[PDB]
Paper text:
The filamentous soft-rot fungus Hypocrea jecorina (previously Trichoderma reesei) secretes large quantities of carbohydrate degrading enzymes that act synergistically to degrade cellulose and related plant biomass components. One of these newly identified proteins that were found to be co-regulated with the major H. jecorina cellulases was a protein that was denoted Cellulose induced protein 1 (Cip1). The co-regulation of Cip1 with the other cellulase components in the fungus, and the fact that it contains a CBM, points towards a role (catalytic or carbohydrate binding) for Cip1 in the degradation of complex cellulose substrates. The Cip1 core domain structure is best classified as having a β-sandwich jelly-roll fold.
The two β-sheets consist of a total of 15 β-strands, eight in β-sheet A and seven in β-sheet B. One of these β-sheets (B) forms the floor of a large cleft and in the lower part of the molecule there is a “grip”-like motif where part of the other β-sheet (A) forms the “palm” and a protruding loop forms the “bent fingers”. A calcium atom was found to provide the best fit with regards to both B factor and metal coordination geometry. The calcium ion in the structure of Cip1 is hepta-coordinated and bound to seven oxygen ligands. The side chains of Glu7, Ser37 and Asp206 provide four of these, the latter bindjng in a bidentate mode with both oxygen atoms. Cip1 was treated with EndoH prior to crystallisation, trimming the glycosylation to leave only one bound N-acetyl glucosamine molecule. This can be seen in the structure, where Asn156 binds a NAG on the surface of Cip1 just outside the “grip” region.
Author numbering: 1 to 218
Write the structure that this text describes.
Amino acid sequence: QISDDFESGWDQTKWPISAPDCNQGGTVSLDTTVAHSGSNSMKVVGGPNGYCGHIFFGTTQVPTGDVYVRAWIRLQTALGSNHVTFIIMPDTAQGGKHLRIGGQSQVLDYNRESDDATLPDLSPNGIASTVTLPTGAFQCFEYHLGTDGTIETWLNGSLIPGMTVGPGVDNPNDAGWTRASYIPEITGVNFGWEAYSGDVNTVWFDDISIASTRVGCG
Ligand SMILES: [Ca+2]
């Protein structure tokens, strides 16, 4: 459980840098000119050096059991076709490999590092069932990881059907995700930018809350 409006700045021990394996060219900084709440947010700029250009800040202060994450997110450039990532969660259910939230085929999705599965399937109907991340303004992004396989995702309070799965929940485009039984067991949440293609973008994060209960959009 952890929250931050960044109005007291960037506490670097609360929100350390993460750049697994390699670190070349990405930046994390407090921005005092772009924000959702108040004056400040966290600005992440991916470096132009493929995967190694990645960078994140994050925390291991995550509850066990149900987890709700909420962040206000501003994206500079529209999501393209390439596979990109802006949230990584080390996952015990994948032996430490990452549950990722990002973009592919111009829309938001989940991705498992272990087997490269996506939620939704990136079929035409799957793509239609998820959404783009609008640019140039802070968006309220929230998700819930349950204990029974449930995953729920909201943008500006509206459920994203393609990015929602779980016991008895009818998602017609969840085949890749549910091939094997998968229940997340995350140990951290990291916010930033990563792209194997070397796609560069700038993403700002403000008003982060991680909790055992639904946060909402204020
Ligand atoms: Ca703020």
